[PDB]
């Protein structure tokens, strides 16, 4: 939950956000985390949960 | 800014004896930027 704030600030995440309102998709958030290759699979699952 | 020209060049290390630079950099930064962005920047073909 410390790295989360960083990635949310990271433009890569803001880019992966296409929705104008800002809310990325559950499948799309999975992509943002996939890009940074920072959080591991189960970690991304927990973040989604 | 000028150096941005030799990165994709096939002979980037012509005088420097380290001929593994392109690979070293690719593998070290590859996970974060992917293996295709680094390959494009360094003009190296993974398919090759």
PDB file of C-alpha atoms in Angstrom:
ATOM      1  CA  UNK A   1       0.000   0.000   0.000  1.00  0.00           C
ATOM      2  CA  UNK A   2       3.035   2.290  -0.090  1.00  0.00           C
ATOM      3  CA  UNK A   3       3.939   1.367  -3.670  1.00  0.00           C
ATOM      4  CA  UNK A   4       0.283   1.804  -4.618  1.00  0.00           C
ATOM      5  CA  UNK A   5       0.269   5.594  -4.133  1.00  0.00           C
ATOM      6  CA  UNK A   6       3.462   5.801  -6.251  1.00  0.00           C
ATOM      7  CA  UNK A   7       2.020   3.751  -9.170  1.00  0.00           C
ATOM      8  CA  UNK A   8      -1.275   5.750  -9.033  1.00  0.00           C
ATOM      9  CA  UNK A   9       0.871   8.906  -9.386  1.00  0.00           C
ATOM     10  CA  UNK A  10       2.999   7.190 -12.074  1.00  0.00           C
ATOM     11  CA  UNK A  11       1.940   8.540 -15.509  1.00  0.00           C
ATOM     12  CA  UNK A  12       2.157   4.957 -16.879  1.00  0.00           C
ATOM     13  CA  UNK A  13      -0.870   4.156 -14.665  1.00  0.00           C
ATOM     14  CA  UNK A  14      -2.584   7.472 -15.489  1.00  0.00           C
ATOM     15  CA  UNK A  15      -1.997   6.579 -19.184  1.00  0.00           C
ATOM     16  CA  UNK A  16      -3.450   3.047 -18.785  1.00  0.00           C
ATOM     17  CA  UNK A  17      -6.487   5.004 -17.466  1.00  0.00           C
ATOM     18  CA  UNK A  18      -8.564   5.718 -20.620  1.00  0.00           C
ATOM     19  CA  UNK A  19     -11.918   6.290 -18.865  1.00  0.00           C
ATOM     20  CA  UNK A  20     -12.398  10.102 -18.669  1.00  0.00           C
ATOM     21  CA  UNK A  21     -13.911   9.905 -15.149  1.00  0.00           C
ATOM     22  CA  UNK A  22     -10.615   8.285 -14.006  1.00  0.00           C
ATOM     23  CA  UNK A  23     -11.932   4.909 -12.796  1.00  0.00           C
ATOM     24  CA  UNK A  24      -9.887   2.225 -14.647  1.00  0.00           C
ATOM     25  CA  UNK A  25     -11.483  -1.237 -15.230  1.00  0.00           C
ATOM     26  CA  UNK A  26     -10.825  -4.234 -12.922  1.00  0.00           C
ATOM     27  CA  UNK A  27      -9.313  -5.953 -16.007  1.00  0.00           C
ATOM     28  CA  UNK A  28      -7.545  -2.622 -16.841  1.00  0.00           C
ATOM     29  CA  UNK A  29      -6.083  -2.057 -13.334  1.00  0.00           C
ATOM     30  CA  UNK A  30      -4.740  -5.607 -13.726  1.00  0.00           C
ATOM     31  CA  UNK A  31      -2.954  -4.194 -16.831  1.00  0.00           C
ATOM     32  CA  UNK A  32      -1.455  -1.127 -15.054  1.00  0.00           C
ATOM     33  CA  UNK A  33       0.100  -3.404 -12.393  1.00  0.00           C
ATOM     34  CA  UNK A  34       1.171  -5.845 -15.165  1.00  0.00           C
ATOM     35  CA  UNK A  35       3.055  -2.958 -16.873  1.00  0.00           C
ATOM     36  CA  UNK A  36       5.139  -1.910 -13.805  1.00  0.00           C
ATOM     37  CA  UNK A  37       5.949  -5.639 -13.221  1.00  0.00           C
ATOM     38  CA  UNK A  38       6.206  -4.447  -9.560  1.00  0.00           C
ATOM     39  CA  UNK A  39       3.382  -6.303  -7.725  1.00  0.00           C
ATOM     40  CA  UNK A  40       3.338 -10.072  -8.179  1.00  0.00           C
ATOM     41  CA  UNK A  41       0.291 -11.950  -9.457  1.00  0.00           C
ATOM     42  CA  UNK A  42      -1.283 -12.805  -6.098  1.00  0.00           C
ATOM     43  CA  UNK A  43      -0.425  -9.305  -4.908  1.00  0.00           C
ATOM     44  CA  UNK A  44      -2.400  -7.823  -7.804  1.00  0.00           C
ATOM     45  CA  UNK A  45      -5.254 -10.191  -6.979  1.00  0.00           C
ATOM     46  CA  UNK A  46      -5.250  -8.938  -3.387  1.00  0.00           C
ATOM     47  CA  UNK A  47      -5.166  -5.319  -4.554  1.00  0.00           C
ATOM     48  CA  UNK A  48      -8.149  -6.011  -6.805  1.00  0.00           C
ATOM     49  CA  UNK A  49      -9.997  -7.636  -3.902  1.00  0.00           C
TER      50      UNK A  49
ATOM     51  CA  UNK B   1      20.940  14.558 -27.149  1.00  0.00           C
ATOM     52  CA  UNK B   2      23.508  13.739 -29.834  1.00  0.00           C
ATOM     53  CA  UNK B   3      24.263  10.355 -28.261  1.00  0.00           C
ATOM     54  CA  UNK B   4      20.592   9.425 -28.838  1.00  0.00           C
ATOM     55  CA  UNK B   5      21.803   8.550 -32.388  1.00  0.00           C
ATOM     56  CA  UNK B   6      24.252   5.654 -31.716  1.00  0.00           C
ATOM     57  CA  UNK B   7      21.867   3.722 -29.402  1.00  0.00           C
ATOM     58  CA  UNK B   8      20.081   1.864 -32.271  1.00  0.00           C
ATOM     59  CA  UNK B   9      23.275   1.688 -34.377  1.00  0.00           C
ATOM     60  CA  UNK B  10      24.410  -1.906 -35.048  1.00  0.00           C
ATOM     61  CA  UNK B  11      27.988  -1.035 -33.995  1.00  0.00           C
ATOM     62  CA  UNK B  12      27.370   0.946 -30.754  1.00  0.00           C
ATOM     63  CA  UNK B  13      30.389  -0.664 -28.975  1.00  0.00           C
ATOM     64  CA  UNK B  14      33.021  -0.446 -31.727  1.00  0.00           C
ATOM     65  CA  UNK B  15      35.954   0.806 -29.627  1.00  0.00           C
ATOM     66  CA  UNK B  16      34.785  -0.101 -26.126  1.00  0.00           C
ATOM     67  CA  UNK B  17      35.661  -3.757 -25.609  1.00  0.00           C
ATOM     68  CA  UNK B  18      32.428  -4.646 -23.771  1.00  0.00           C
ATOM     69  CA  UNK B  19      30.367  -6.193 -26.578  1.00  0.00           C
ATOM     70  CA  UNK B  20      27.635  -7.378 -24.174  1.00  0.00           C
ATOM     71  CA  UNK B  21      26.384  -3.876 -23.245  1.00  0.00           C
ATOM     72  CA  UNK B  22      23.145  -4.062 -25.305  1.00  0.00           C
ATOM     73  CA  UNK B  23      22.167  -7.420 -23.688  1.00  0.00           C
ATOM     74  CA  UNK B  24      23.220  -6.378 -20.170  1.00  0.00           C
ATOM     75  CA  UNK B  25      21.070  -3.215 -20.353  1.00  0.00           C
ATOM     76  CA  UNK B  26      18.155  -5.114 -21.992  1.00  0.00           C
ATOM     77  CA  UNK B  27      17.995  -7.781 -19.251  1.00  0.00           C
ATOM     78  CA  UNK B  28      18.578  -5.329 -16.343  1.00  0.00           C
ATOM     79  CA  UNK B  29      15.818  -2.804 -17.361  1.00  0.00           C
ATOM     80  CA  UNK B  30      13.775  -5.312 -19.403  1.00  0.00           C
ATOM     81  CA  UNK B  31      11.127  -6.250 -16.824  1.00  0.00           C
ATOM     82  CA  UNK B  32      10.133  -2.613 -16.004  1.00  0.00           C
ATOM     83  CA  UNK B  33      10.078  -1.297 -19.648  1.00  0.00           C
ATOM     84  CA  UNK B  34       9.302  -4.650 -21.285  1.00  0.00           C
ATOM     85  CA  UNK B  35      11.662  -6.497 -23.659  1.00  0.00           C
ATOM     86  CA  UNK B  36      10.165  -4.764 -26.769  1.00  0.00           C
ATOM     87  CA  UNK B  37      10.728  -1.045 -25.833  1.00  0.00           C
ATOM     88  CA  UNK B  38      14.352  -1.711 -24.871  1.00  0.00           C
ATOM     89  CA  UNK B  39      14.848  -3.777 -28.020  1.00  0.00           C
ATOM     90  CA  UNK B  40      13.466  -0.929 -30.132  1.00  0.00           C
ATOM     91  CA  UNK B  41      15.633   1.666 -28.390  1.00  0.00           C
ATOM     92  CA  UNK B  42      18.831  -0.385 -28.692  1.00  0.00           C
ATOM     93  CA  UNK B  43      18.099  -1.589 -32.224  1.00  0.00           C
ATOM     94  CA  UNK B  44      18.454  -5.227 -31.189  1.00  0.00           C
ATOM     95  CA  UNK B  45      16.133  -7.973 -32.436  1.00  0.00           C
ATOM     96  CA  UNK B  46      15.063 -10.604 -29.913  1.00  0.00           C
ATOM     97  CA  UNK B  47      13.548 -12.608 -32.758  1.00  0.00           C
ATOM     98  CA  UNK B  48      17.062 -12.659 -34.189  1.00  0.00           C
TER      99      UNK B  48
END
